[PDB]
């Protein structure tokens, strides 16, 4: 159990049930393992659970601030990470030396958390134990070494997507989208993706009255333009006014007293989850995928996926099994994972959102600061978590969320907008929601050059990039 | 627990259970926890209390249950768990009422179960390890009747007609007074003359006190010399801190994990404690009390405060049933009336079962029923409410609605209220009174004897 | 005040007051606040409650007072201040008890005073304008008799004999049921047939309900046709949210500093509110109730829940006295029985005054008396305990101990319990019952008539010992 | 005090006041505290907030007010008392709404009053010395018009057409940038070019910062060389701990009973403090600020955060009025726009008065408005809601609805939302924008110049229905 070892030319004491060599560091075994840094730890890498959760370096000396309101905690992170009075992360954590090296501890199995103190990295599996990776070295080197031990699914280059969410939000209809399709089809997009707003209800994944000719009709018009058709679902989410909620109360995820597990608060109502441990639910969700493929869509945005993994680390085994079936039912269709457990999705997702939603503004200070919720929409929140998850790029297509080119119906400044555009070039994941008729001539030309040219992009440090020959520094926002 | 779908009473019903199979009147489930989802929006929940005195009634599950005060009286009012929860839990069986007045019923078929009710769910959970359930959807009466048919039975002819000392003299009884009343009562068509609480020296000292100087065998012989059976009252598993037995056998007191005596409530002006009914010595000693009473000449026994043998609630029913089974064996064919007793867990052992709180010479003590939110305290309205919701047990046991009043002296009840309690006793066939005949007016004497008369059945 | 030294009962008594003057049986003090120090260690404090139903009794000032429950019932139980305090406060008069049974008494001679009792101190404090005090040291009965001689008096001859409807039928009364009972009641030596709660449409709607179709003047004429005076019950300053008057005259509701209605208790299943007796228009409406009843032919009036006119306690006594003074003039020579009423501030206006909780057909409701710690609810023990400690008011008013039971039907009291109440009626001379003659056995009928028709001499041998005719009646066991 | 009966709007009204006389449209009451009882079940209370940004709206008296969060912002949202209290209080005036859409109105005629609304009561209380009130019952518009006639008026022709630098550049302004914008703006029919917050070195240090290197008189001269008047922004009684005035004159800071600085809110990322407007030396320093701006060439002044001169609420209105009267004197005939200001206590001193929360380039920050329960934050919906409920002041002062947006660049508002704000600018005649002309598309430039150049007739049809030109504009959905 007590072990000493030479890691990164340093002496590291640890507690584990087993130890063996691994590329870039060591493999540890143990349901709970403890690693003692050979330095005064200046920073802890706090890795949130899902896409929207916070990923960043924090001062472990200061106490975490409660996220408010309590009703939103299930949609912001692993509930355990938000209730605890210590700094816990999901899957992986790291301590930062005075010299900017990192001591990294990362699980190789589902369902783990990592606690950070200035004197200790503690890894704990929620369910049954498993393997760990430990490494000490340059920050980028050890996160690269850890990612190499995780599954990968790299399906060529990420497609270029036009998305209806970040301009029209839920106010979409078949008529409006045919008009926009004609605008958008003049640009070098590959996918026209219809986002939230087409469905009758959560759990009622059929077209509402503003899509009267139906969804296969829409996908056909999209394909007659040379484009792939994309469609948005939140497959395991349900509200109390959903007909599925009332027709199949046995599908709702429930606690020990039979009450529905709370999945957050959104669209002005409490969210609930369908039980992804229920075989009948899982095949109903797999049938949603098969239905969208029969409709002609071959790009799918699966949202609010944390709901299949509630209540946190403990639900990742159920989540993985249910996502594997969706992966099987999609065949080779492109699956974009959103609101999704980040590390537990690798190998199933083709693309993965790694940050909070962008928004047509830098930061809502009431939500970010007074309610202490960094998971809310906004470009700053988006950038900060995204910056701390680019090391996943050899495992999945990293989606930084859409890029804005418009100045109409947008509060962002041009220098802020270019920060988001740079990360789209770095990850290669290029998406926008800007309807071409909201763009000025100069902005049309920037959108088409953004789609049509592959700009080389170089990382110089954690927050410094050269894209083209321009230098882009992200350090101030943190 | 597998997910299951079934057609029940003409509706699709989803449920979660380890097993399912056909049963007369519905289906039978297996599982430590089972979950049944109503195929309707539920208008009400049948809340079945634990013991004789507990509330049994239909409640609105939307409104939270009101805490029972004082806290010190909770152990003698219900399963303590049911009184600490902020949800609507029942004992053994629960039901949900559909908008057409049909009921969806989930009832346990083994010991130690509780039923959680909400407008959207029936959850049954065994405190111990798993067991069987009965699930039925149909007319309210049919569905409860069908459930009772799968529970133990002990139907011992017709119930005796009893004269009982409690609801006139309470504890202020003595040998000379009861001999005087016996000669008056013997002019009526009674079978049992039963001495209630007040003859003993202490709880746990079940020997005559100084108001019974010639002793209990003497009194039983005088009762039998009039053609009557002699009845006697015990509270065998109850004890107080000043009882000699509490001091002599502290190893018999029911204790918690830290050695502290479990609280059994508050009565006779002092705190109550329980003898440990899982202690084999305690059960033999309680069985000796039954034998001693038969040897004295008593062959009708009122066994009271029996919840004490089953604390802390559902989890204690297995010990309770085993100890009562020993007492059933020691009583032979004597008639046993179970009072203050776990209702369903008593079935098949008791000849008679009190199913409601004590009657009282008044409709309702509002200070206890309302301000203290305790519906288990004595009073005719509390008695009728729970009794009316347990009549479906009439094929398993003699249902005791408690005594019937005929006097107007020393009684606050109206004649109309009195005839309500009389009607219930006709219906169940369990006829008892505590009225001393010398307290009765001539009109009331005739009403009492006419009531003890065998029924002339009417039906149209 | 000034520090002062006194010889009072053969003892040296130290005190702080503004003025000192001799008085029959003791001394007279002045001061908004006065402090008297017992020249002895004190074993008991006389705690005098505010109104009819309130506890009057000797208590141990060392133990803390038990909160009365529920909170909703405190406005109708006592002066709210005495019930929210951690120390022992009484209304108007207090006393400390020496080892020899002798009592040091401090009593207000004016409105609006409270008295605080500790083992080492009696503290009198007027709530509004200052006033006079009576201070005395001596044997318990002498000292209270001397205090009562300085209070107002109104002795309207001898107390009438009353049949009252409350303690048999309660609110289930009707015109025809009362005509039948009137027939039976008229054979006995009663002087008043009194209709209690149950004849009115609502609190504030003092008009006959459906069960009195021919109206109240008719009922009173039939009563007088049988040689009996007619009595009627009111709660003049009480109103509920349901009352039409509460809705028509919101400016009549007693309100606090933020305009919310002042709570006056919980009864008949609903929260109670008060009409403002400082509002001249409300007082004149309540005097119109008295005038309307006299015009109907009633000249005996039971005026109940009168604490509502004096809320929030001592502070309301000056308003209370002025409103009652007006109802006194409106009633003329009619007989006014005060109930639920500030005891001391009623003297000189009431002809009769209830001095204890309602009797009930039972000894004690233990749930209310012990678990809720409310000794002001109905019950014979509660009635007896407070009445026994207010008999010294027979100097000043007809002391009503509440009715006497003779029936054993529809009654839980024992015969020995019932005789304790009957003796207090002989001692006070206030003789009343609610027993319908048709509920009485023949033996009980004979006892009732001999009760009304004879005057049995009662003498007090001590605080709890009386001699009624030839029998010693001892009450001390009930404390 | 005295109880009074009243025939108001053909209804009977009970009230409590020390005096009563006739007045145009209703009655004048006198009393430090008065109470009025509605002759109906009141369905709504008009809760009138203290200052410009405070909530003005009809609320359900039955449901409880929700605490505004965070607590650090309460001093800049309303009168602190109105936020701390568990009942519904408003400032100066309140009203109760009948089932028939009429209002019972109670409004102070003097400084320093609050009104409490209950379902059954309107209670007016002066914080300081008593004063007069106005009571009226009638159609909603007539009684608010009747009340406004009794208050001071200062109506200076028509409101000028203003270009303002705040709602596009916020604090990020400079001399060079504003000369460029001045050149585009001067092509449009504006009367005032107003430099907002961002020119000064600090709060309390009202001198040009390093981005205004040639100073502020230079800027006003360039503005006048275009035929425009120059306008300038101050927050004259506001200071922060990092202000040099905070350290150089600690004796000017408004302090509580323990000498700690009164907190004036949280803004620009730091705690706000107030200068003591009861200090004669502070009042003359602020008057000198006005004189300095006049000598610089500015004759249009935006006086912001004025609640700070009136802290802690109704109690500070007398000080506030004296200090504002001195600034009014030092400004002469210059145009004074009051922002962040006690609404009723500013009448007669202000030429223009902001009556709502700041507009913002979005409809509503739901985190601030709902989760933090702060309807005083910037947002068009918050702006409209309070403004709509203060249009009845249009005959006492120029009512400023805040600026109108025409741009769609750097703005999240939809065109239908933007027209709602444009309509109120026509209704009040107060026409302002912050849109830099180079942020506007060609079609938006034409709408701006047509907005400035044509007077569009506008008709109120009901509380939230307006006919402006020939469009019908309904605001009822937003509430």
Is the distance from CB of C301 to CB of C327 less than 8 angstroms? no
Q: What number of other Cβ atoms are within 10 A of residue D220's Cβ?
A: 24
Exposure of D256 in the CB half-sphere (CA atoms within 13 A): 8
C319: part of which helix (H) or strand (E)? helix C317-331
Beta-bridged to residue A434, according to DSSP, are: none
Distance from CA of D150 to the nearest CA of C (A): 27
Which one, of A273, A153, A178, lies nearest residue A229 by Cα? Answer: A178
Separation of alpha carbons A473 and C110, rounded Å: 86
Q: For residue A50, give both structure tokens.
A: 């899902």
Separation of alpha carbons D422 and D407, rounded Å: 12
Q: Which residue has the tokens 């054979």?
A: C187
Is the distance from CB of C232 to CB of C298 less than 8 angstroms? yes
Contact B371 C70 (CB under 8 A): yes
Contacts of C411 in chain B (CB under 8 A): 409-410, 412
Separation of alpha carbons B167 and B187, rounded Å: 20
Contact D412 A407 (CB under 8 A): no
Q: For residue A115, give both structure tokens.
A: 């606690």
Q: What is the resolution in angstroms?
A: 2.5
Name the phi and psi angles at B366, rounded to 5.
Answer: -65, -30
Instruction: Tell me how many degrees the CA angle D152-D155-D158 measures, rounded to the nearest 5.
Output: 160
Separation of alpha carbons A5 and C448, rounded Å: 105
- Scanning D46-85 for CB atoms below 8 A from A yields 69-70
Contact D87 C279 (CB under 8 A): no
Question: Per residue in C205-219, is it b (16+ CB within 10 Å) or e — as a string?
Answer: ebebeeebeeebebb
Which one, of D109, D128, D79, D144, lies nearest residue D344 by Cα? Answer: D109
Strands (E), C363-413: 398-400
Instruction: Reduce the DSSP state of residue C222 to 3 states and report it.
Output: helix
Q: Which residue has the tokens 């109903």?
A: A284
C293: part of which helix (H) or strand (E)? helix C280-296
Of B361, B367, B410, which has the smallest distance from its Cβ to C367's Cβ? B367
Separation of alpha carbons A52 and D96, rounded Å: 47
Contacts of A360 in chain D (CB under 8 A): 412
Is the distance from CB of C75 to CB of C263 less than 8 angstroms? yes
HEC per residue, chain D = CEEEEEEECCEEEEEEECEEEEECCEEEEECCEEEEECCCCCCEEEEECCECCCCEEEECCCCCCCCCCCHHHHHHCCCHHHHHCCCEEEECEEEEECCCCEEEEEEECCCCEEEEEECCEEEEEECCCCCEEEEEEEEHHHHHHHHHHCCCCCCCCCCCCEEECHHHHCCCCCHHHHHHHHHHHCCCCCCEEEECCCCEEECCEEEECCCCCCHHHHHHHHHHCCCCEEEEEECCCEEECCCHHHHHCHHHECECCCCCECEEEEECCEEEEEECCCCHHHHHHHHHHHHHHHHCCEEEEEECCHHHHCCCCHHHHHHHHHHHHHHHHHHCCCEEEECCCEHHHHCCCCCEEECCCCCCCCCCCHHHHHHCCCCCCCCHHHHHHHHHCCHHHCCCCEEECCCCCCCCECCCCCHHHHHHHHHHHHHHCCCEECCCHHHCCHHHHHHHHHHHHCCCCEEECCCCEEEECCEEEECCCCC
Contacts of C258 in chain D (CB under 8 A): 87, 116, 123
- Going by the DSSP 8-state scheme, the letter that residue B253 receives in this structure is B
Is the distance from CB of A162 to CB of A431 less than 8 angstroms? yes
Q: Is A214 left (phi over 0), alpha (psi -120 to 50) or beta?
A: left
Instruction: Reduce the DSSP state of residue C184 to 3 states and report it.
Output: helix
Query: What strands, in cross-sheet order, belong to the sheet with D44-48?
Result: D19-23, D26-30, D132-139, D102-108, D93-97, D44-48, D56-59
Which one, of A93, A47, A134, A85, lies nearest residue A341 by Cα? Answer: A47
Instruction: Reduce the DSSP state of residue C33 to 3 states and report it.
Output: strand
Name the phi and psi angles at A288, rounded to 5.
Answer: -60, -45
HEC per residue, chain A = CEEEEEECCEEEEEECCEEEEECCEEEEEECEEEEECCCCCCEEEEECCECCCCEEEECCCCCCCCCCCHHHHHHCCCHHHHHCCCEEEECEEEEECCCCEEEEEEECCCCEEEEECCCCEEEEECCCCEEEEEEEEEHHHHHHHHHHCCCCCCCCCCCCEEECHHHHCCCCCHHHHHHHHHHHCCCCCCEEEECCCCEEECCEEEECCCCCCCHHHHHHHHHCCCCEEEEEECCCEEECCCHHHHHCHHHECECCCCCECEEEEECCEEEEEECCCCHHHHHHHHHHHHHHHHCCEEEEEECCHHHHHCCCHHHHHHHHHHHHHHHHHHCCCEEEECCCECHHHCCCCCEEECCCCCCCCCCCHHHHHHCCCCCCCCHHHHHHHHHCCHHHCCCCEEECCCCCCCCECCCCCHHHHHHHHHHHHHHCCCEECCCHHHCCHHHHHHHHHHHHCCCCEEECCCCEEEECCEEEECCCCC
Q: Which residue has the tokens 């403090």?
A: D273
Contacts of B442 in chain C (CB under 8 A): none
The alpha carbon of residue D444 and the mean position of all alpha carbons in its chain are separated, in whole angstroms, by 28
Torsion C220-C224-C225-C227 (CA) sign:
positive
Contact A250 B123 (CB under 8 A): no
How far is CA B50 from each of CA A70, A204, B88, B111, C285, rounded to the nearest angstrom?
37, 43, 13, 12, 56
- Scanning B101-160 for CB atoms below 8 A from A yields 116, 118, 120-121, 123
Which one, of A464, A473, A439, A449, lies nearest residue A187 by Cα? Answer: A449
What technique was this entry resolved by? Answer: X-ray
| D456 and chain A in contact, CB less than 8 A | no
Separation of alpha carbons B323 and B349, rounded Å: 11
CATH value at residue A285: 3.20.20.70
Q: What number of other Cβ atoms are within 10 A of residue C470's Cβ?
A: 7
Instruction: Reduce the DSSP state of residue C427 to 3 states and report it.
Output: helix
Torsion D10-D15-D19-D23 (CA) sign:
negative
Q: For residue A111, give both structure tokens.
A: 């369902």
Distance from CA of B125 to the nearest CA of A (A): 10
Give the length of chain B: 460
Confirm whether B304 is a catalytic residue.
yes
Separation of alpha carbons C312 and C292, rounded Å: 29
How far is CA A349 from each of CA A154, A337, D407, rounded to the nearest angstrom?
9, 6, 41
- For residue A281, give the chain B residue with the closest CA: B3
Supply the range of the domain harboring residue D422: 161-474
Of A249, A257, A278, which has the smallest distance from its Cβ to B37's Cβ? A249
Query: What strands, in cross-sheet order, belong to the sheet with D432-433?
Result: D398-400, D352-354, D335-338, D298-303, D229-234, D192-195, D162-164, D432-433
| A277 and chain B in contact, CB less than 8 A | no
The alpha carbon of residue A285 and the mean position of all alpha carbons in its chain are separated, in whole angstroms, by 20
Angle, nearest 10°, between helix axes A414-427 and A379-387? 30
| C371 and chain B in contact, CB less than 8 A | yes
B96: part of which helix (H) or strand (E)? strand B93-97
Instruction: Reduce the DSSP state of residue B17 to 3 states and report it.
Output: strand
Is the preceding peptide bond at A69 cis, omega within 30 degrees of 0?
Answer: yes
Contacts of A376 in chain D (CB under 8 A): 367
Distance from CA of D341 to the nearest CA of A (A): 24
Contacts of C19 (CB under 8 A, 6+ apart): C28, C29, C30, C31
Which one, of B274, B286, B268, B265, lies nearest residue B246 by Cα? Answer: B274
Of A250, A258, A279, which has the smallest distance from its Cβ to B14's Cβ? A250
| B32 and chain A in contact, CB less than 8 A | no
Q: Are strands B432-433 and B162-164 parallel, antiparallel or unpaired?
A: parallel
Exposure of B258 in the CB half-sphere (CA atoms within 13 A): 1
Instruction: Reduce the DSSP state of residue C379 to 3 states and report it.
Output: coil
Is the preceding peptide bond at A311 cis, omega within 30 degrees of 0?
Answer: yes
Instruction: Reduce the DSSP state of residue C383 to 3 states and report it.
Output: helix
Contacts of B361 in chain C (CB under 8 A): 412
């Amino acid at each position: 159990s007590h072990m000493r070892l030479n890691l990164g030319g340093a002496e590291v004491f640890l507690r584990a049930e087993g130890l063996e060599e691994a590329p870039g560091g060591v493999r540890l075994w143990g349901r709970e393992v403890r690693v003692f840094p050979p330095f005064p730890a200046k920073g802890f890498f706090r890795h949130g659970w899902q896409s929207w959760s916070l990923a960043a370096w924090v001062d472990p000396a200061q106490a975490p601030t409660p996220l408010l309101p309590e009703a939103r905690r299930p949609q912001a992170d692993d509930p355990f990470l938000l209730e605890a009075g210590a700094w816990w992360g999901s899957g992986v954590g790291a301590l930062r030396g005075p010299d900017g090296r990192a001591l990294l501890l990362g699980a190789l199995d589902l369902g783990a958390r990592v606690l950070g103190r200035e004197d200790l990295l503690l890894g704990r599996y929620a369910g049954k134990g498993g393997a760990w990776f430990l490494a000490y070295g340059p920050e980028e080197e050890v996160f690269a070494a850890y990612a190499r031990l995780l599954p990968r699914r790299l399906s060529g280059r990420p497609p270029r997507v036009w998305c209806s969410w970040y301009s029209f939000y839920t106010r979409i209809g078949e008529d409006l989208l045919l008009r926009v399709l004609d605008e958008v089809a003049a640009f070098s997009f590959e996918v026209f993706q219809i986002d939230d707003g087409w469905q009758r209800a959560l759990g009622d994944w059929e077209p509402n009255d503003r899509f009267p000719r139906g969804m296969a009709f829409l996908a056909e018009r999209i394909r007659e333009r040379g484009l792939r058709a994309g469609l948005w679902f939140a497959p395991f989410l349900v509200t109390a006014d959903s007909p599925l909620f009332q027709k199949r109360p046995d599908w709702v995820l429930r606690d020990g007293e039979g009450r529905p597990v709370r999945a957050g608060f959104n669209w002005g109502r409490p969210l609930y989850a369908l039980d992804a441990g229920n075989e009948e639910v899982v095949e109903w969700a797999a049938d949603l995928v098969r239905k969208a493929l029969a409709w002609g869509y071959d790009y799918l945005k699966l949202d609010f996926l944390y709901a299949a993994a509630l209540p946190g680390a403990e639900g990742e085994a159920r989540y993985r099994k249910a996502m594997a079936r969706l992966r099987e039912a999609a065949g080779e269709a492109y699956l974009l994972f959103c609101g999704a457990p980040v590390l537990a999705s690798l190998g199933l997702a083709d693309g993965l959102r790694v940050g909070p939603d962008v928004a047509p503004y830098w930061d809502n200070e009431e939500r970010s600061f007074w309610l202490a919720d960094p998971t809310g929409p906004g470009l700053r929140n988006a950038l900060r978590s995204t910056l701390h998850r680019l090391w996943l790029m050899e495992n999945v297509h990293v989606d930084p969320d859409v890029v804005y080119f418009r100045t109409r119906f947008n509060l962002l400044s041009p220098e802020e907008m270019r920060l988001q555009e740079a990360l789209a070039h770095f990850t290669g994941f290029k998406a926008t929601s800007d309807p071409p008729s909201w763009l000025l001539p100069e902005e049309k030309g920037r959108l088409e050059a953004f789609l049509a040219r592959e700009v080389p992009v170089r990382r110089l440090g954690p927050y410094r990039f050269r894209v083209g020959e321009e230098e882009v520094d992200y350090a101030p926002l943190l």
